[PDB]
């Protein structure tokens, strides 16, 4: 909604740090599957 993210399954605001940590947890191999060069 504009420039903020909401995750609704109930519905909570999704701060940037949460996505940052999730992306950090993502592994390099999954980047190839997602079509993004990890290096």
């Amino acid at each position: 909604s504009g420039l903020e993210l909401y995750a609704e399954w109930k519905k909570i605001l999704l701060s940037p740090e949460r996505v940052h940590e999730i992306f950090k947890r993502i592994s390099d191999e999954e980047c190839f599957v997602l079509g993004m060069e990890p290096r």
Binding site: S15, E17, R18, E21, I22, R25
Partner: protein, 171 residues
């Protein structure tokens, strides 16, 4: 309107009596004579006696004659402390300092006598709320320790990452 401000005036007269200090309860008709309520109808007085006098918490009934409850308001600092302890035990909460002030002369001296046992919290309306301290457990927190606490944020830490950190550190 009719028959409301008169009741308010009676209740205010009771506060004025209590600033006077006459503990002895007074007759309602005599109160009316003092407050110039003779003109008012008798039926409204009877309705007040039956319903409003009992509903008012400050009012009390003794030997068929109505007056304030000398027990409700604080009279001594020791009783204030005991009431605070009981309120803490039963989860009542603190009491308003303005009400305690009108209740008790030199309430500020009473609080000074309390000292550490009594904890006062400011309010935007300047009213002071009082909470008993816990004698059983006493702890000290230092500002540097509170700061070292403050920086760290678990909200940054994701719950799975939590259980993962324990499992990683081998325990």
């Amino acid at each position: 309107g009719y028959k409301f401000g008169v009741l308010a005036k009676i209740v205010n007269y009771m506060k004025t009596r209590h600033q006077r200090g006459d503990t002895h309860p007074l007759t309602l008709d005599e109160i009316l004579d003092e407050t110039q309520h003779l003109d008012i109808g008798l039926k409204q007085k009877q309705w007040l006696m039956t319903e409003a006098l009992v509903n008012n918490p400050k009012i009390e009934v003794i030997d068929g004659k109505y007056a304030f409850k000398p027990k409700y308001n604080v009279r001594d600092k020791k009783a204030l402390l005991r009431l605070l302890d009981q309120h803490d035990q039963r989860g009542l909460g603190g009491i308003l300092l303005e009400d305690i002030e009108e209740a008790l002369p030199n309430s500020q001296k009473a609080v000074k006598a309390l000292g550490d046992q009594i904890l006062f919290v400011n309010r935007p309306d300047k009213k002071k709320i009082l909470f008993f301290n816990d004698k059983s457990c006493q702890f000290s927190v230092d500002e540097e320790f509170q700061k070292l606490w403050r920086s760290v944020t678990v909200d940054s830490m994701d719950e799975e990452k939590i259980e993962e950190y324990l499992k990683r550190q081998g325990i």
